């Protein structure tokens, strides 16, 4: 099957003498598994998923030291950027990075990623060939030239084809029965007040995992892709998700409508009706 690992890094400078805050979050199949935050009492990478407790202290030490280095690196790059963009000291700035790999169905490297954003906008990114860069503006063209001269791409390419892949395979092994779990949605329909003979029927899907899901209302079992109200999928805070879809219906005609719920944990799609 297809899998992925990613490290999301953020560095924010703040008004004053105080140094930037650096946060690094690791993910495997979009699930946070490690985290480092320079704001903590004793800054260190910490497991964020039970299965990471398997890693010994040499791992946490190595990773924490890598992060202490990143903190400085981001401090330097943030300063360089202020110069490229002609910005004064005393403002708030944000530098972000996303790095990692995607494995194909054959479990081989499908694509390597390494990009940066500044003030929330694309700054520079390594292309799929993992040899050349795409700069988003003039300032980033400065970085691009600098890195082509230094051969920065070769460093990331080795990481993306070596370490990223090796460790992603290891993590998938250690967290087998976890990343692959599913929680079927528990669904129900609510009924809400008729604006002049018209009632709103709302289909709720709750407690599901993962978050991918599709809710579809139908009339007499026939598709109803058009006048349907949806809500962005949301976290319940307990690890599961929620979502709902509603549709306006003529009071007295609600037994005709059915809501279909599709989700990987479901033995078959769910079919619901008001009451």
């Amino acid at each position: 099957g297809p899998h992925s690992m990613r490290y999301f890094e953020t560095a924010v400078s703040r008004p004053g003498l105080e140094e930037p805050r650096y946060i690094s979050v690791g993910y495997v199949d979009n699930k946070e598994f490690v985290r480092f935050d320079s704001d903590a009492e004793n800054p260190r990478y910490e497991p964020r998923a039970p299965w990471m407790e398997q890693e010994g202290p040499e791992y946490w030490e190595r990773e924490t030291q890598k992060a202490k280095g990143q903190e400085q690196w981001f401090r330097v790059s943030l300063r360089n950027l202020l110069g490229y963009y002609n910005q004064s000291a005393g403002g708030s700035h944000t530098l972000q990075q996303m790095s990692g790999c995607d494995l194909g169905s054959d479990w081989r490297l499908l694509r390597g990623y390494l990009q940066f954003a500044y003030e929330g906008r694309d700054y520079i990114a390594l292309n799929e060939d993992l040899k050349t860069w795409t700069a988003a503006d003039m300032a980033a063209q400065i970085t691009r030239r600098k890195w082509e001269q230094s051969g920065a791409a070769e460093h990331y390419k080795a990481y993306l084809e070596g370490e990223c892949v090796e460790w992603l395979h290891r993590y998938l092994k250690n967290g087998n029965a976890t990343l692959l779990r599913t929680d079927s949605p528990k669904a129900h329909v609510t009924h809400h007040p008729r604006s002049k003979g018209e009632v709103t029927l709302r289909c709720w899907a709750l407690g599901f995992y993962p978050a991918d899901i599709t809710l579809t209302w139908q009339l007499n079992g026939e598709e109803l892709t058009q006048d349907m109200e949806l809500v962005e999928t949301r976290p319940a805070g307990d690890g599961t998700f929620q979502k709902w879809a509603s549709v306006v219906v003529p009071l007295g005609k609600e037994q005709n409508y059915t809501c279909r719920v599709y989700h990987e944990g479901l033995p078959e799609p769910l079919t619901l009706r008001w009451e």
Binding site: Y7, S24, E63, W73, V76, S150, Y156
Partner: peptide
Amino acid sequence: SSVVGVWYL
């Protein structure tokens, strides 16, 4: 396992 930066932006 994360990557570290070498050359700066």
